[PDB]
Swiss-Prot record:
Disulfide bonds: none annotated. This is RNA-binding protein 39. Residues 5-83 form the RRM domain. The gene is RBM39. Residues 46-87 are annotated as: Activating domain. Antibodies against RBM39 are present in sera from a patient with hepatocellular carcinoma who developed several autoantibodies. Aryl sulfonamide anticancer drugs, such as indisulam (E7070) or E7820, promote ubiquitination and subsequent degradation by the DCX(DCAF15) complex. RBM39 degradation results in splicing defects and death in cancer cell lines. Aryl sulfonamide anticancer drugs change the substrate specificity of DCAF15 by acting as a molecular glue that promotes binding between DCAF15 and weak affinity interactor RBM39. Widely expressed. Highly expressed in pancreas, skeletal muscle, lung and brain. Expressed at intermediate level in kidney, liver and heart.
Amino acid sequence: MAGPMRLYVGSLHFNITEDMLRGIFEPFGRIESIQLMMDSETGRSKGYGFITFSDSECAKKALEQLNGFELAGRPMKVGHVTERTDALELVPR
RNA sequence: AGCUUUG
């Protein structure tokens, strides 16, 4: 099978936690890691986070399965992860 | 800290 795969997770209430995501995506694929985003200034949640799977096809499953799932009643978004530094970084000529 | 939005 393919190697591990990592996805974005969001649209989560602050009431959501890294522990719930552990039970959310695990039955779809063996979880290799999670990183729920938290504020540097207050340590509070951010309502989104990262998660890694043992297989890309198991991540792709938990993707379309939890994509719009009403976790705590709000549809959580899921999708592939990607760089974004080019969205705002710059350098002199 | 509340919302799709990304290390």
